[PDB]
A and B are shown apart, each in its own frame.
Chain A
Amino acid sequence: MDNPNPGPDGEGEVELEKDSNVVLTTQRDPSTSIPAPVSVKWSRWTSNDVVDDYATITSRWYQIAEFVWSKDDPFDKELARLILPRALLSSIEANSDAICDVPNTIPFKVHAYWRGDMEVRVQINSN
C-alpha cells in the first residue's frame, strides 16, 4: 500500500464511459445519486404508433451547460437551474442553430412524445 510511482504516463488510473461515439473520461470516482429506480417502458398503454429509441444517436453525451464558478459567488447561490429535457434543446438553440443540426435531438424535431431516463455528469475542473 501507498507506493507512489508517477511516470511520463501519469500516476493514476483513468476510467472511461463510452457511448455511441462519445467517450468522456474522469480521473475521479463519481458521486452517484439516483433519486428513483429505473422506469418501465410504458409505450404499451398509450401508443399504437411506431415507437423506437434512437440509441445510436440519442444516447450520446452532449454538453448543455458550462459556467464559471468564481469565489465571488456567495454561499447560498444558484449556479445553473437546468430544466433537463428542455436544456438539451435550449442549449442548442443558445448555440444559434436549429434542433435538427445536432444528432442527439433530431427525434425531438420529428416525434411528438418522449419517455426516457437521463444520465447527467456534472464535471468540475477545480484545482
Chain B
Amino acid sequence: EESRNTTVLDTTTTLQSSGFGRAFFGEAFNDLKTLMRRYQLYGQLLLSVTT
C-alpha cells in the first residue's frame, strides 16, 4: 500500500507546531486552495494586427 507505515523508529521528541506559520507570521499556509487564489501570470502577448 502507499501510505502504510510499518515500524516508526522514532528518535525525535515533540516539535512545537507553528500552525503553518500562524505562530510567527500571523497567517496559516496549510490550505493550498488559498495560495492558488494569488494571481499568477497566465499569458503575455504583443498585439499584432494582420488584416
Contact = CB atoms under 8 A, between A and B. Distances in A.
Nearest to B18: A45
A116 to B, nearest CB: 19
B15 interface: yes
A49 B16 contact: no
Interface residues of A, number: 8
A71 interface: no
A74 B10 CA distance: 61
A1 interface: no
B12 A48 contact: yes
B51 interface: no
A47 B15 CA distance: 7
B16 A48 contact: no
B18 A49 contact: no
A97 to B, nearest CB: 33
A50 B13 CA distance: 7
Interface in A31-74: 44-51
Given A45-B16, A47-B13, A49-B12, 5 more contacts: A44-B15, A45-B18, A48-B14, A49-B13, A50-B13
